[PDB]
Design a protein around this ligand. Structure first.
Ligand SMILES: O=c1[nH]cnc2c1ncn2[C@@H]1O[C@H](COP(=O)(O)OP(=O)(O)O)[C@@H](O)[C@H]1O
Ligand SMILES: O=c1[nH]cnc2c1ncn2[C@@H]1O[C@H](COP(=O)(O)OP(=O)(O)O)[C@@H](O)[C@H]1O
Ligand SMILES: O=c1[nH]cnc2c1ncn2[C@@H]1O[C@H](COP(=O)(O)OP(=O)(O)O)[C@@H](O)[C@H]1O
Ligand SMILES: O=c1[nH]cnc2c1ncn2[C@@H]1O[C@H](COP(=O)(O)OP(=O)(O)O)[C@@H](O)[C@H]1O
Ligand SMILES: O=c1[nH]cnc2c1ncn2[C@@H]1O[C@H](COP(=O)(O)OP(=O)(O)O)[C@@H](O)[C@H]1O
Ligand SMILES: O=c1[nH]cnc2c1ncn2[C@@H]1O[C@H](COP(=O)(O)OP(=O)(O)O)[C@@H](O)[C@H]1O
Ligand SMILES: [Mg+2]
Ligand SMILES: [Mg+2]
Ligand SMILES: [Mg+2]
Ligand SMILES: [Mg+2]
Ligand SMILES: [Mg+2]
Ligand SMILES: [Mg+2]
Lengths: 153, 153, 153, 153, 153, 153
């Protein structure tokens, strides 16, 4: 696994409304992942329906899209070794009832329809979601001063 | 699972003595559950014996009742969807040696006889414990300003 | 100054609504003060008008009483040396615009009409407010295990 | 002082490198101010020279511009009553040696050339800095669920 | 079973460099374990090869020893019931990829070659490492003021 | 002015007993100062009377020395620009009654005889106390990975 793997993490409107932007960012920051893109956005319905295109037949699809439209979203790209899988572990189970304390949803969420955050489920879906939400010039290239202390190689 | 389920959470005398009232309250508060009743109490011996009536024949019963009388207790009623089961998850395993870091006992406790907190183990036992520790007038009815961001309509 | 001085600290309805019960309690807990009484209450208008009786001629009186009635209040009695004066310093300036970061209002509040918390301004007013909000049996007598490490005598 | 006043807050490259994005955001988030715009950026040299145009003749100007180009910047717009003046108070004194513990620089910074953050010093300079760093479409209009608990009607 | 059990916990050079001494000590402090010895040391290569003598044939041995020499180490001895096994649970899995959020490595580490901390894996090895890193005079004898609230003994 | 200035910071026995080692170290760690020496010690009465030799005629001298002997002490040396003066500002006023929230004593202490911590009051006295508490080999030489982000030098 390469240390330049990237994943798309988004703070959903309930996370923004409930004042969780700082804490959620700190979870990935303290773990050692690198923030390479971030923006507060209120994306159009078409973009949100494309983001959740695989769930278009689910009965909760229209309520999911309407709720994702109901407030601002903090869209982020994080970079690090196995950041996709480990990011999902940091977020916790999709349904917060099954999430463990110490994860984001295990500390902050209750309802699956209000699970505060989103994270890419696979490397290929991460590449697709990053391109959907961000322009290439919005990803910032930099090197952390503690890179050699987080990674062995 | 309705959003008005209630559970009884109590900070035991060792949790009060060790200065854990704030942190324990924050665990439930940050998760999104609603505090509907709270009071610091030094309840009578007969109340603690009735609270632990199911363990009256356990060899540690008299020691448990005497220790629960040795200091103040912060009794609380929390309200939320599946707050009984999720409350037990937040508290962690009864024996802290089996609890996971990130839970209350996994972060703060070591001995099973000093597990710093108590939580109702079922909805029916919650209703019993709420009626034992709180008069009905002590439960406050209110609507959280972020209720519609914690729960899906 | 005696180490058994007591003050009345209350988390106002905006503090409860905004999820600040845990953090505020931790401020007094970590400082070394002793919690001797606490209860979540929704007091009647008559009690709130008597609490603020000295402000009955102020133009903001009726709005203050209505806002104090609009949600639950976490009423507390804290005990410690100079807990009245030091408690006021922990809360910060009445108007949060003049409060310093590191105080409760300096960290959590903006408007003077929504300053999250209340604290007794003098020892004699503290004795009056404690008797107004609490029955004598609601004050719990106990001794902290770290009393001799917080106080020299 | 209306509740829709806006200020420009930016986490400088040293604050990003030292992993302070989360904690700094939480300072404003917990205080009750509304995040209306945010993005991670590596802006052009001419933008940073215009940002610090009032200091073009200071001897540290070229060093300041070069250091502000040495890493990513988290640019933010925060909205709230007196957010410009209170924002400066939260940040602390420009020289961290003169800053007080509890402020951002008083908690995290030492050197004036590495004071981890920037904040607009006046309302008119805030409007200038907002127009320089953000397109108008990047400011998101929304209503905080706890607005009526942060501000008096 | 015995509350006087001791284990060797070390903050590795990557943990010191990334400013994690405070948070790591707090994990064991808040849990209820007693610190009986601590020192910041830069031990010679011969001592580190003794410490990892059982891994002398591993292909990562040379890189491990070099990395352990690259910075200061915070050597500690913690005392408490089952502190060896529980200490390992607090640290998390050796490979942070497999660790859970809420543990030290689950909150702060990514690479197995940079897992921030070390903990004794057995009681016998703990006694061996304590004698290797500490002189017998460096272990301080004291009794915590909250010992009877942490343990039922 | 020089970034290699050093000061002696000690966590007094009341700070150790009340579980404040972690939080206190974090204050200096997060500020950007470098820990160059640390050890948990129980120094003899003769060393403590040397440390407080200028107060030998004070009426509280005997009680101070006895209290400093009543538990372990976490002796530390921190290095950074103006670390002596800024270190005193982080600790807060000698009498916690006069300290401000956000400082160590303003967050954790009440009595002047139990002020949790000690800090050198001048550079010359710092050099004297460092030589009194530490051997020259116990001061570790290293360079922080974020040194160039903390200092403009
Ligand atoms: O059963 C449901 N009812 C309401 N919302 C759901 C339900 N299942 C999933 N969701 C929402 O849709 C989002 C995406 O669902 P998905 O199946 O992709 O899980 P994921 O977010 O962990 O990748 C979830 O995060 C959740 O907010
Ligand atoms: O074996 C024991 N020795 C001493 N105390 C025990 C023991 N087992 C349980 N307890 C204490 O009795 C309390 C109630 O026991 P219970 O079986 O109901 O666990 P619970 O608190 O998770 O519901 C426990 O929280 C614990 O403090
Ligand atoms: O000018 C005002 N407009 C609206 N509310 C005010 C004003 N001044 C004071 N208050 C509110 O009344 C409460 C009590 O006022 P007081 O003068 O006693 O200050 P204090 O709360 O610090 O003791 C204040 O905390 C505040 O909530
Ligand atoms: O004397 C100096 N040497 C190096 N950098 C300085 C000096 N004075 C100010 N700066 C830097 O320039 C920035 C802008 O200067 P200004 O006077 O506007 O303070 P401000 O950031 O509080 O508004 C400061 O934040 C600081 O980073
Ligand atoms: O596969 C590896 N590659 C690089 N370093 C490793 C590897 N496996 C273990 N290590 C490092 O060696 C140290 C000691 O190895 P050990 O097998 O004893 O795990 P432990 O620290 O949990 O007891 C580990 O903490 C880790 O830093
Ligand atoms: O009046 C007093 N009564 C009891 N202890 C005192 C008193 N004044 C100072 N001390 C204690 O002696 C220690 C050293 O006194 P000093 O005057 O040097 O203050 P300092 O620690 O800020 O340098 C103080 O930290 C405090 O613990
Ligand atoms: Mg999906
Ligand atoms: Mg039971
Ligand atoms: Mg008044
Ligand atoms: Mg300026
Ligand atoms: Mg091993
Ligand atoms: Mg002195």
């Amino acid at each position: 696994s390469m240390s330049n793997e990237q994943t798309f993490i988004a703070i959903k409107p309930d996370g923004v409304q409930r004042g969780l932007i700082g804490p959620i960012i700190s979870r990935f920051e303290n773990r050692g992942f690198k923030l390479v893109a971030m923006k507060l956005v209120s994306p159009p319905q078409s973009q949100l329906e494309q983001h959740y295109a695989d769930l278009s037949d689910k009965p909760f699809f229209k309520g999911l899209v309407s709720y994702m439209l109901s407030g601002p979203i903090c869209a982020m790209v994080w970079e690090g070794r196995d950041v996709v899988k480990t990011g999902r572990t940091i977020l916790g189970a999709t349904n917060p009832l099954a999430s463990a304390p110490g994860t984001i949803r295990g500390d902050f969420a209750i309802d699956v329809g209000r699970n505060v955050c989103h994270g890419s489920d696979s490397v290929e879906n991460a590449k697709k979601e990053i391109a959907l939400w961000f322009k290439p010039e919005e990803l910032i290239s930099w090197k952390s001063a503690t890179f050699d202390w987080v990674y062995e190689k």
